[PDB]
Design a protein around this ligand. Structure first.
Ligand code: A1H4P
Length: 502
């Protein structure tokens, strides 16, 4: 499903692959070898290869002569279902027809590379469960692989670990007979669908990879130390899982809602979008905002885009309807001379009407990294609906990449948390940047992780990529870059240290 991404290939290897194994319309994507956030889409057209740059500074994937996207899987799905839409600098059309599959197993959750049968047995015994499995290098037979599978009752002998040898002959893979596969992923997927049955009848069911990302929070420093010499590899394994999250976005794709999206292809999932009720009867579609509910799976969030001039009223309808009392803004209104969010709040001491809502800015307070605006929101014609909405406007995030130190963000998020916790029956905390996925996702995931450690103290289990995957199932592309991914680990580490210091 995401086999067109080749994590460890060079430009010339990509060219030769497309020229010898592909046809016109063949394509693949790959990282830049030294440049994080740069990717290349390599495509074959008229017997030649073209390389198309995709940049991601933290907000979205920006395809040259194409559009902006929330994930590379969403980018490929869009253009595979939309020909004539990707053009060269000269205007000529670049068709993405045939993904060119990668055989490299390194971003599979189940692939552990160098590892002994004894090490894999203890890992499967301590962490594993029925159907927990891994693939590793053989050591006895160089170039071969072993599949190790735990099967049993959930140390009393009711469970066991089997080792199935996997031969590699002609760069095809087999388990001793039957089909020979072009890759270990194809072998795993096959024996996931069609499990091996032993002679005495044990079914070697490959239910889940062994979890290697879950850590005890107290031991965060050791995991970060280990990832710092990696973070790229762990991030790319997470990114491989995004092909499971192509959920429908049909409401955002409606003609009627086109001009309510900051970026035409960055859309909320139908199953978690905020639906706005009590709309204008004369506006035929008034139930739409580019926003999703994010539930940790007590505090929930709405992840949304920066307002457009035509969505400011809808934004306030959302805040009112959802009973939100805290907004987190993670962008300046303008960065690099581009508008990222329209000003949707009044100047200090001023009162403005936004459709049927009225907002007073009571007071602003400037801190180093942020401005707090104390806002009063009510429905026009109904005085007893007034509530305070506290807008925390983070002002010092760099235009590209992440802050060099997480202290400013953590102090900000602590103040947000206490504000939210002090307000009886407050609704979800609204979080927004520009597209509402990169910074927004980073702030939300840090908030969710810190909240676990707040309830359960320094001795609790956290699992960063599992948390991100769960949030990504609720809005597209939450947490955009490897730099945000590392920043998340650094923020949790700093949080833990300040608590051990105390
Ligand atoms: C859910 C849980 C874990 C992961 C995961 C991200 N990087 C990984 C490296 C090795 C194994 N698993 C992972 C992704 C989704």
């Amino acid at each position: 499903s995401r086999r067109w991404f080749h994590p460890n290939i060079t430009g010339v290897e990509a060219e030769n692959l497309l020229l010898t194994r592909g046809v016109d319309g063949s394509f693949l994507a790959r990282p830049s070898k030294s440049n994080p956030g740069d990717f290349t889409l390599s495509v074959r057209r008229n017997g030649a290869v073209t390389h198309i740059k995709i940049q991601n500074t933290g907000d979205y994937y920006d395809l040259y002569g194409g559009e902006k996207f929330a994930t590379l899987a969403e980018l490929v799905q869009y253009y595979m279902e939309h020909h004539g839409q990707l053009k060269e600098k000269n205007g000529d059309v670049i068709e993405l027809k045939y993904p060119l599959n990668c055989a490299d197993p390194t971003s599979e959750r189940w692939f552990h590379g160098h590892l002994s049968g004894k090490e894999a047995e203890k890992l499967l015994t301590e962490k594993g469960k029925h159907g927990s499995f891994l693939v590793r290098e053989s050591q006895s037979h160089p170039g071969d692989f072993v599949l190790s599978v735990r099967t049993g009752d959930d140390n009393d002998g009711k469970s066991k670990v089997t080792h199935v040898m996997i031969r590699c002959q002609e760069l095809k893979y087999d388990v001793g007979g039957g089909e020979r596969f072009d890759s270990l992923t194809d072998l795993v997927e096959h024996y996931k669908k069609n499990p091996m049955v032993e002679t005495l009848g044990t079914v070697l069911q490959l239910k889940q990879p062994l979890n290697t990302t879950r850590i005890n929070a107290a031991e965060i420093e050791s995991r970060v130390r280990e990832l710092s010499k990696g973070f790229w590899e762990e991030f790319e394994t997470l990114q491989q899982q995004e092909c499971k999250l192509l959920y429908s976005r049909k409401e955002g794709q409606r003609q009627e809602n086109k001009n309510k999206n900051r970026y035409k292809n960055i859309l909320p999932f139908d199953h978690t979008r905020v639906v706005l009720h009590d709309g204008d009867p004369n506006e035929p579609v008034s139930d739409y905002i580019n926003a999703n509910i994010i539930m940790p799976e007590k505090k929930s969030y709405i992840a949304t885009q920066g307002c457009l001039q035509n969505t400011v009223n809808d934004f306030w309808r959302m805040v009112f309807q959802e009973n939100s009392r805290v907004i987190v803004m993670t962008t300046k209104e303008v960065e690099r001379g581009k508008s990222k969010c329209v000003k949707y709040w009044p100047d200090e001491y001023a009162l403005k009407e936004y459709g049927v809502m009225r907002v007073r800015n009571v007071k602003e307070s400037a801190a180093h990294d942020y401005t707090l605006r104390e806002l009063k929101l009510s429905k026009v014609g109904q005085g007893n609906t007034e509530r305070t909405v506290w807008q925390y406007h983070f002002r010092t995030w760099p235009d590209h990449g992440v802050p060099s130190d997480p202290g400013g963000v953590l102090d900000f998020l602590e103040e947000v948390h206490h504000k939210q916790e002090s307000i009886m029956d407050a609704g979800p905390v609204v979080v927004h940047c520009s597209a509402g996925i990169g910074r927004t996702g980073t702030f939300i995931v840090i908030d969710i992780l810190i909240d676990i450690i707040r309830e359960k103290g320094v001795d609790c289990d956290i699992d960063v990529p599992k948390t991100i995957q769960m949030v990504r199932s609720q809005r597209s592309g939450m947490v955009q870059t490897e730099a945000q991914y590392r920043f998340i680990y650094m923020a949790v580490q700093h949080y833990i240290e300040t608590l051990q210091r105390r």
